Design an enzyme around this catalytic site. Structure first.
Site, PDB file in Angstrom:
ATOM      1  N   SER A   1       0.805  -1.222   0.000  1.00 22.39           N
ATOM      2  CA  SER A   1       0.000   0.000   0.000  1.00 22.39           C
ATOM      3  C   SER A   1       0.843   1.280   0.000  1.00 22.39           C
ATOM      4  O   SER A   1       1.721   1.452   0.850  1.00 22.39           O
ATOM      5  CB  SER A   1      -0.940   0.017   1.213  1.00 22.39           C
ATOM      6  OG  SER A   1      -1.622   1.263   1.313  1.00 22.39           O
ATOM      7  N   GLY A   2       0.564   2.163  -0.961  1.00 21.02           N
ATOM      8  CA  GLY A   2       1.267   3.436  -1.066  1.00 21.02           C
ATOM      9  C   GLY A   2       2.573   3.439  -1.852  1.00 21.02           C
ATOM     10  O   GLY A   2       3.225   4.475  -1.984  1.00 21.02           O
TER      11      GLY A   2
ATOM     12  N   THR B   1      -0.890   2.812  -8.468  1.00 24.40           N
ATOM     13  CA  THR B   1      -1.895   3.605  -9.158  1.00 24.40           C
ATOM     14  C   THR B   1      -1.287   4.755  -9.971  1.00 24.40           C
ATOM     15  O   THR B   1      -1.738   5.038 -11.083  1.00 24.40           O
ATOM     16  CB  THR B   1      -2.935   4.136  -8.155  1.00 24.40           C
ATOM     17  OG1 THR B   1      -3.598   3.021  -7.538  1.00 24.40           O
ATOM     18  CG2 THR B   1      -3.975   5.016  -8.859  1.00 24.40           C
TER      19      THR B   1
ATOM     20  N   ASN C   1      -1.734   5.444   2.955  1.00 20.00           N
ATOM     21  CA  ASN C   1      -1.797   6.185   1.705  1.00 20.00           C
ATOM     22  C   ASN C   1      -2.954   7.177   1.728  1.00 20.00           C
ATOM     23  O   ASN C   1      -4.086   6.817   2.057  1.00 20.00           O
ATOM     24  CB  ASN C   1      -1.953   5.200   0.544  1.00 20.00           C
ATOM     25  CG  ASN C   1      -1.879   5.872  -0.805  1.00 20.00           C
ATOM     26  OD1 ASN C   1      -1.733   7.091  -0.900  1.00 20.00           O
ATOM     27  ND2 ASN C   1      -1.990   5.078  -1.864  1.00 20.00           N
TER      28      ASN C   1
ATOM     29  N   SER D   1      -5.423   5.897  -1.124  1.00 24.17           N
ATOM     30  CA  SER D   1      -5.434   4.449  -1.244  1.00 24.17           C
ATOM     31  C   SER D   1      -6.596   3.949  -2.099  1.00 24.17           C
ATOM     32  O   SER D   1      -7.737   4.374  -1.934  1.00 24.17           O
ATOM     33  CB  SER D   1      -5.513   3.813   0.143  1.00 24.17           C
ATOM     34  OG  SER D   1      -5.493   2.404   0.042  1.00 24.17           O
ATOM     35  N   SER D   2      -6.288   3.056  -3.031  1.00 25.88           N
ATOM     36  CA  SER D   2      -7.310   2.473  -3.887  1.00 25.88           C
ATOM     37  C   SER D   2      -7.949   1.410  -3.002  1.00 25.88           C
ATOM     38  O   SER D   2      -7.251   0.516  -2.521  1.00 25.88           O
ATOM     39  CB  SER D   2      -6.675   1.809  -5.114  1.00 25.88           C
ATOM     40  OG  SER D   2      -5.753   2.675  -5.759  1.00 25.88           O
TER      41      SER D   2
ATOM     42  N   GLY E   1      -2.828  -2.707  -2.763  1.00 26.87           N
ATOM     43  CA  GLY E   1      -1.584  -3.286  -2.273  1.00 26.87           C
ATOM     44  C   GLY E   1      -1.567  -3.950  -0.911  1.00 26.87           C
ATOM     45  O   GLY E   1      -2.449  -3.750  -0.087  1.00 26.87           O
TER      46      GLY E   1
ATOM     47  N   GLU F   1      -1.324  -4.696   2.737  1.00 25.72           N
ATOM     48  CA  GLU F   1      -1.473  -3.749   3.840  1.00 25.72           C
ATOM     49  C   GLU F   1      -1.635  -4.401   5.199  1.00 25.72           C
ATOM     50  O   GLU F   1      -2.193  -5.490   5.320  1.00 25.72           O
ATOM     51  CB  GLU F   1      -2.660  -2.799   3.596  1.00 25.72           C
ATOM     52  CG  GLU F   1      -4.038  -3.466   3.508  1.00 25.72           C
ATOM     53  CD  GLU F   1      -5.176  -2.450   3.372  1.00 25.72           C
ATOM     54  OE1 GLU F   1      -4.936  -1.352   2.839  1.00 25.72           O
ATOM     55  OE2 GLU F   1      -6.315  -2.753   3.783  1.00 25.72           O
TER      56      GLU F   1
HETATM   57 MG   LIG Z   1      -3.561   2.494  -5.371  1.00 28.24          MG
END
Ligand SMILES: [Mg+2]
Ligand SMILES: Cc1ccc2c(c1)C(=O)[C@@]1(O)CCN(c3ccccc3)C1=N2
Length: 690
Positions: free
Chosen positions: A180-181, A185, A225, A228-229, A449, A451
């Site tokens: 994550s982060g 993306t 993030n 974050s997605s 991602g 996490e």
């Molecule tokens: Mg993302």
């Protein structure tokens, strides 16, 4: 040619700068150095020492403190001649070891060179700052250029995949990994920007405007993030036989809809909520009964309503503009915001206990507000929330839920509304981008991602399992199939065990025989008397002291640990059965099916959005839906030629110019970067038949 002009932005922002005569003197030196650990406990903290002498099997070097140590040559991490410092492809390093690889990335990173090749794949270290290397001028430079003819860049690997698609008439895929982060993306967008350009006057623009929409409803601030997605996605860029962009398709995966009704401290709900409240006109605010984020239960619990450096009002405008370019009617757009506003009102409904155990609703302000924007009958909604009707055999019985259950049902409605709206949004977008049968495509994978939070739930398991699977896909293509080829064609190759295999973890999670965590989860989901407690007891029974990737903690009775490639994660079992069953009172669906609003009506009447498959007697579980989407992705990836980009987070503070060795090295290790470089060096990558 900017490529050979040391004054161009290209050279300024993508090449290592010319060293001076002082550096030249150090570069022609005869001295030899080694990377050593000043502290044997801190294996990732390295210092540079000079080798002063050697025996047949060891080196003796000097430490920074002018001291002397010895080390066997077999355990020695020699430092590469400094002429290699900043090298664009690390498969070229003479000494391939952890401190050497990390040092090279550090040297480049220190000069804002975030991209570096590790043999066949690209490594990308998140800069956490803007770097001017994504301009149209930059895109034109990479157009049609061989990888070894230009500096490492996300554009280059994109162009290679494009040429391979045309040269081999084969579908391609860009698999961007990262916790994550790490930058997945951001790089995904770059890939699409570049392809849209080189293979591209209105479609391409709409393709680009699709992201800001998805991110407003699909992204949110987490502790790792700011953007974050919270849903993964596979983007298909479609081309015709000539090689021109004919369209694009967005395959979205399960959304973390639980975030709409709950956010841990310091996080935020989805961006859209803050964008609407901060960017809505004074009139929209009156029509939707809006007010400040601090006024809504769904937005005032985390203690955070804003993101540094981000303007929600300004972002709202960008979302609206995106919605316009894609083609969302002013009516559709308004209905969308009514749903967003309605959700907020629903969250403000406060259930209270009545004379008996059943809940009552004294103040009906929020209820009325939600009913208003949603276009549904408040009396009906009220009954559907606290007194839903169910079948008791064949008899029709009106329930009377207590406060807790009423609240949960209310959240279920909210999550269904949002999740369905998201599906609707993606569906609409695909209609616009899909208008021509394609001949080929390049798929770009951008999953949520890996996490870890203080509290990890069902969502985190699925997310981390996805990451576990993508890493295994990398191991498979880089090591398994690679050597399978060598032994198939038999060029006198002795198999090598690279020590990278996530199969045990994968089996523990999705194994069939014996049954894995998800299988048992589903099993408990049908068991009429199962509780989260009986579920974890069941898991411990099957894996405690039995599976090497599983751990039954001694410090808790509600958590279990899973050892992932990226590290061990402790999962809290609370709410797993309900999250997996993902129930919703039919009376609530009947209430909204009668909504006067078109969008709303579509969310509850459109089968491909409102309907749910049935696993025989029961509705398909979320774990089952999860497995289906994963399987679908893996099958698709098999029909493509994969390209890997490994995104690397520099630290856990989202700060630029702060490359922390421990953080980076753990990723380099679990990603299999060095092993990836070793296979490229020791093996034979390209090979064409006679
Ligand atoms: Mg993302
Ligand atoms: C191919 C695939 C399959 C399943 C997935 C994903 C991707 C995601 O990244 C998702 O969007 C990321 C979040 N998520 C999820 C969240 C809550 C509950 C179930 C799945 C996801 N599961």
């Amino acid at each position: 040619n900017p490529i050979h002009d040391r004054t161009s932005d290209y050279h300024k922002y993508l090449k290592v700068k010319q060293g001076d005569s002082d550096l030249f003197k150090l570069t022609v030196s005869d001295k030899r150095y080694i990377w050593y650990n000043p502290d044997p406990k801190e294996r990732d903290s390295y210092e540079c020492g000079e080798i002063v002498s050697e025996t047949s099997d060891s080196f003796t070097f000097k430490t920074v403190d002018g001291q002397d140590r010895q080390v066997k040559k077999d355990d020695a991490n020699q430092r590469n001649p400094i002429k290699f410092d900043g090298v664009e492809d690390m498969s070229e390093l003479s000494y391939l070891n952890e401190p050497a690889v990390f040092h090279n990335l550090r040297v480049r990173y220190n000069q804002d060179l975030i991209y570096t090749y590790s043999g066949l794949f690209l490594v990308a270290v998140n800069p956490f700052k803007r770097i001017p290397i994504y301009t149209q001028e930059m895109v034109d430079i990479f157009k049609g250029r061989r990888r070894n003819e230009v500096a490492p860049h996300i554009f280059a690997i994109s162009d290679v995949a494009y040429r391979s698609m045309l040269d081999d008439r084969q579908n391609q895929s860009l698999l961007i990994t990262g916790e994550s982060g790490a930058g997945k993306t951001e790089n995904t967008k770059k890939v699409i920007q570049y392809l849209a350009s080189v293979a591209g006057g209105v479609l391409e623009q709409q393709i680009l405007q699709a992201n800001p929409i998805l991110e407003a409803f699909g992204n949110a601030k987490t502790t790792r993030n700011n953007n974050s997605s919270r849903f993964g996605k596979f983007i298909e860029i479609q081309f015709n036989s000539a090689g021109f962009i004919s369209g694009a398709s967005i395959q979205s995966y399960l959304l973390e809809k639980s975030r709409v009704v709950f956010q841990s401290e310091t996080e935020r709900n989805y961006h859209i909520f803050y964008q609407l409240l901060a960017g809505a006109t004074a009139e929209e605010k009156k029509a939707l009964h809006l007010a400040g984020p601090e006024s809504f239960n769904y937005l005032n619990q985390s203690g955070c309503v804003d993101i540094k450096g981000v303007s929600d009002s300004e972002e709202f405008k960008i979302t609206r503009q995106a919605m316009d370019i894609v083609g969302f009617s002013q009516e559709e757009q308004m209905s969308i915001f009514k749903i967003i506003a309605g959700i907020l009102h629903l969250g403000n409904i406060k259930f209270e206990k009545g004379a008996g155990e059943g809940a009552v609703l004294k103040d009906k302000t929020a209820l009325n507000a939600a009913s208003t924007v949603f276009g549904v009958n408040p009396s009906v909604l009220e009954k559907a929330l606290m007194e839903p009707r169910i079948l008791a055999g064949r008899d029709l019985v009106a329930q009377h839920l207590n406060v807790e259950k009423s609240s949960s049902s209310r959240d279920a409605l909210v999550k269904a509304l949002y999740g369905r709206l998201f599906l609707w949004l993606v569906k609409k977008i695909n209609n616009v981008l899909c208008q021509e049968r394609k001949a080929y495509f390049i798929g770009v994978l951008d999953i949520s991602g890996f996490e870890i939070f203080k509290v990890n739930s069902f969502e985190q398991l699925c997310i981390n399992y996805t990451n576990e699977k993508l890493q295994q896909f990398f191991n498979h293509h880089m090591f398994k199939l690679e050597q399978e080829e060598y032994l198939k064609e038999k060029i006198n190759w002795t198999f090598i065990d690279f020590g990278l295999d996530s199969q045990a973890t994968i089996d523990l999670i999705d194994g069939r025989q014996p049954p894995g965590i998800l299988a048992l989860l589903d099993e408990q989901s049908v068991f009429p008397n199962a509780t989260d407690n009986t579920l974890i007891t069941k898991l411990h029974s099957h894996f405690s002291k039995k599976n090497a990737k599983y751990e039954e903690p001694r410090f808790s009775k509600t958590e279990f640990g899973v050892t992932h490639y990226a590290g061990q994660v402790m999962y809290e079992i609370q709410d797993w059965l309900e999250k997996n069953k993902d129930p919703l009172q039919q009376d609530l669906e009947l209430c909204f099916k009668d909504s006067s609003d078109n969008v709303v009506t579509k969310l509850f009447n459109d089968p491909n959005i409102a309907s749910r498959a049935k696993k025989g007697a029961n509705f398909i579980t979320v774990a089952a839906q999860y497995k289906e989407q994963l399987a679908s992705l893996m099958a698709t990836l098999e029909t493509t030629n994969p390209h890997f980009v490994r995104c690397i987070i520099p630290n856990n503070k989202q700060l630029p110019a702060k490359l922390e060795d421990k953080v980076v090295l753990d990723q380099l290790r679990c990603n299999g970067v060095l092993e990836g470089i070793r296979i490229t060096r020791k093996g034979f990558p390209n090979r064409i038949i006679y």
